[PDB]
Amino acid sequence: MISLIAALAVDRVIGMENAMPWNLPADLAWFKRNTLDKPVIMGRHTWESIGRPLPGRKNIILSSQPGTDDVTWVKSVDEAIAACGDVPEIMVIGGGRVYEQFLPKAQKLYLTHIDAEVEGDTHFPDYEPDDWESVFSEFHDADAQNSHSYCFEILERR
Numbered sequence: 001m002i003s004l005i006a007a008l009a010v011d012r013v014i015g016m017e018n019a020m021p022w023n024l025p026a027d028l029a030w031f032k033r034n035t036l037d038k039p040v041i042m043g044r045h046t047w048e049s050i051g052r053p054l055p056g057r058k059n060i061i062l063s064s065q066p067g068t069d070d071v072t073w074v075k076s077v078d079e080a081i082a083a084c085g086d087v088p089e090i091m092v093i094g095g096g097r098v099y100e101q102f103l104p105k106a107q108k109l110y111l112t113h114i115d116a117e118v119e120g121d122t123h124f125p126d127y128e129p130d131d132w133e134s135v136f137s138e139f140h141d142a143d144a145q146n147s148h149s150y151c152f153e154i155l156e157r158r
């Protein structure tokens, strides 16, 4: 199964290259939690951004150009899946363009809403509400570790 998990700021704006203006460890924890024991596919950018391969996961990248580290480097949305093997869940941590490629063959969404105005170009692939049912709804404000109000939404493609 293929799903999508991402941190989208107001206006639906996502990552680009430079790190997003926030520090929500909560989301991070939610990431680990929903990602552990699950293969992942990510764009070059997020790759260099994480700084290190994700522990206890299958580090796969979709680009285009060579592959640095000796993570499963794929060069197509096809190879990617195969390298994911026979798992019950596929974790696509984008970024941007990566997502778009998984949206059609996508079946689930694990996003956290950040009520922060953050300029930028790229956005998250549009999707008609009813087409994606609404299961979860956990909203949390900002306290001491999370510099901004976030919100959890798991969408099951309807």
Ligand SMILES: CN(Cc1cnc2[nH+]c(N)nc(N)c2n1)c1ccc(C(=O)N[C@@H](CCC(=O)O)C(=O)O)cc1
Binding pocket: 005, 006, 007, 027, 028, 029, 031, 032, 035, 046, 049, 050, 054, 055, 092, 093, 094, 110, 111, 112
């Ligand atoms: C730059 N990114 C990509 C990133 C960040 N937040 C996201 N948040 C959500 N909800 N979705 C996606 N796809 C996200 N992707 C990124 C950077 C660092 C960690 C990270 O350090 N994760 C540790 C948890 C935190 C730690 O410092 O150990 C982990 O084990 O997953 C994850 C992702």
